[PDB]
Amino acid sequence: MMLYSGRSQDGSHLLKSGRYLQQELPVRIAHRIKGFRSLPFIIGCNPTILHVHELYIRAFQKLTDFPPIKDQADEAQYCQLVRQLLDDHKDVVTLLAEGLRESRKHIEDEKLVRYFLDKTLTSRLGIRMLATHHLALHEDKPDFVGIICTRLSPKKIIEKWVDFARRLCEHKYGNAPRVRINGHVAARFPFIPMPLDYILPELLKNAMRATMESHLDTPYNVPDVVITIANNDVDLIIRISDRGGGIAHKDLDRVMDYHFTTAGFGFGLPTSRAYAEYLGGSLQLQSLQGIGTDVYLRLRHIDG
């Protein structure tokens, strides 16, 4: 999958981009439909799963019904369709979580659901990146070409999600750990924010929850979460280290399972890992039981 960095004045690059998207979306949607068609019958019969299955069929129908893009007029209407579909599918992760929660227990092969979700969610991420990139090409935001930030600061985007997670945490516990950021705090490079926008708040919420729940006696005084940025020519590494007591030995093999939670659907970790690996990186956990957890997010730098 490619994100067109091309720019032009007649607006021809918008046409080429739209034509590529028009070519690409139906194919990738068809792959998701095949995934639904191959789900174990008893899972596929779940009304929420069926609802999502039908959304995808409906998406494929609308996309294939759209005439080949001939001019900017057509391209403009196609963008309307894509916006509609993006919105129609915005709750898909949540619907799948819900539909699978109970139903998947009716199945011996637990590998199956994991594979279906990894494949379905990462293909969806890719689909949404492509579509959103095309739409964003019409925008005149500085330092962006579509959804590509030409000079992303890891520190800045981390801070954005830190403020977000801290507010959620303060609402629930009356306080939140402070976050310190160190390492390559001045790094700036071309990068696509979207996956960080998913992953970072998931990891931050986990770290803050763990910290508060292990400090119930001193909610007014909890250990900082410490984030380290390492930027090299190959990848970006973001280490998130907390003193929230660690992931217990008895839970460790379970925490990367969809649905597993000690508490919201238990999707944060497996989804984040699937996204990271889909993009050529990884997500690794180091548990110091009794002390805390280090989470390492790695993402490959831009292929230009």
Ligand X SMILES: CC(C)CC(=O)C(=O)O
Structure tokens at 77: 């209407």
SS3 content of the chain, % helix, strand, coil (to 5): 55, 15, 30
The correct pick among 19, 28, 62, 184 for binding its own copies (CB under 8 A) is 184
Closest CA to 252 of 292, 287, 291: 287
Residues of span 218-237 touching its own copies by CB under 8 A: 228-232, 234-235, 237
DSSP state of 273: H
Q: Shortest distance, CB of residue 259 to K ion, whole angstroms?
A: 7
Binding mask 63-102 toward ligand X (x if CB under 6 A, else -) reads: ----------------------xx--x--x----------
One of 5, 150, 153, 289 touching its own copies (CB under 8 A):
289
Helix (H/G/I), strand (E/B), else coil: 179: strand
Check residue 242 for interaction with its own copies (CB under 8 A).
Answer: no
206 binds, among Mg ion, ligand X, K ion, none (CB under 5 to 8 A by kind): Mg ion
Residue 58's contacts (CB-CB under 8 Å, 6 or more residues apart) are: none
- What minimum distance in Å lies between the beta carbon of 173 and its own copies? 24
- Residue 260 interacts with K ion (CB under 5 A): yes or no: yes
Pick 32 or 298: Cβ nearer its own copies: 298
Q: What is the CA radius of gyration of the chain?
A: 21
How is 57-122 classified by DSSP, letter by letter? Answer: HHHHHHHHHSPPP-SHHHHHHHHHHHHHHHHHTTTHHHHHHHHHHHHGGG-S-HHHHHHHHHHHHH
Using rule CB under 5 A, residue 211 touches Mg ion: no
Between 171 and 249, name the residue whose CB sits nearer to its own copies. Answer: 249
**303 lies in the site for its own copies, by CB under 8 A:** no
272 part of the interface to Mg ion, by CB under 5 A = no
**Cα separation of 195 and 140, whole Å?**
21
Taking CA atoms, 178 is separated from 14, 89, 171, 239, 246, in Å, by 44, 35, 15, 16, 18
Q: Which of 117, 131, 194, 208 binds ligand X (CB under 6 A)?
A: 131
Query: Which residue, 59 or 226, has its beta carbon nearer to ligand ADP?
Result: 226
239 forms beta bridges with: 228, 296
268 binds, among its own copies, Mg ion, ligand X, none (CB under 5 to 8 A by kind): Mg ion
Interface with K ion by CB under 5 A: which residues?
260, 266, 269
Interface with Mg ion by CB under 5 A: which residues?
206, 268
